């Protein structure tokens, strides 16, 4: 399966793509404002997110810090990102079909758009100014919207037990972005597409 991942940001961005236990593809790389890049990911990928860093800084072999969504200080992820990362995430082909999702579980960093370039289904989107408008005790300093799991780690915000309801902070993502999961057991907002279709992740789809 392809997936290109464009930055439409006026900031540069290092796009990171993982199953949690590898690196999908090289795993991650710099995106300049405007900038695309082009994966393959294996067919029956389960599990897989890309997501955004921001305010990177590597050295010659790789290896660094990111203020939001740093994956174990590396360029190229093998794991997933530190919170706040707003999250497309993906399993496909399973059992002739593809699930795609946006997910603020893990709080907020960059808008995004997660669509197919295939035809079959429709896309996802959650391009809100959450930052902007992040409640005073969520607001992450090194930048971002944390999710109150992160923050609180309750288990009321971590659904622990599989046992939670929304909450206060569950429902400010919700409100911003209906169409991303907002907490663990949120009404599901995953789309179903043709098994084996083709992808876009944009960071910035509106500005």
């Known amino acids: 399966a392809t997936f290109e991942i464009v930055n439409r ?4 961005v290092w796009a990171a793509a993982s199953k949690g236990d590898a690196a999908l593809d090289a795993g991650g790389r710099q995106l300049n404002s405007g900038e695309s890049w082009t994966i393959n990911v294996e067919p029956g990928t389960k599990g897989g997110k890309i997501w955004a860093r921001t305010d990177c800084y590597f050295d010659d072999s790789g290896s660094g810090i990111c203020k939001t969504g740093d994956c174990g200080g590396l360029l190229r992820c093998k794991r997933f990102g530190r919170p706040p990362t707003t999250l497309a995430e993906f399993s496909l082909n399973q059992y002739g079909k593809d699930y795609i999702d946006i997910s603020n579980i893990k709080g907020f960093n960059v808008p995004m758009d997660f669509s197919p370039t295939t035809r079959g289904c429709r896309g996802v989107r959650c391009a809100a100014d959450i930052v902007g408008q992040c409640p005073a005790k969520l607001k992450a300093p090194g930048g971002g919207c944390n999710d109150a799991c992160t ?3 309750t288990s009321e915000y971590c659904c622990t037990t599989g046992k939670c309801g929304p909450t206060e902070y569950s429902r400010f993502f919700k409100r911003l ?3 991303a999961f907002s907490y663990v057991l949120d009404k599901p907002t995953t789309v179903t597409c043709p098994g084996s279709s083709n ?5 910035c789809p509106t500005a």
């Open 9 to 12: 940001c006026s900031y540069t």
């Open 177 to 179: 972005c209906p169409d």
């Open 151 to 153: 923050v609180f780690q």
């Open 199 to 203: 992808y876009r992740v944009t960071f």
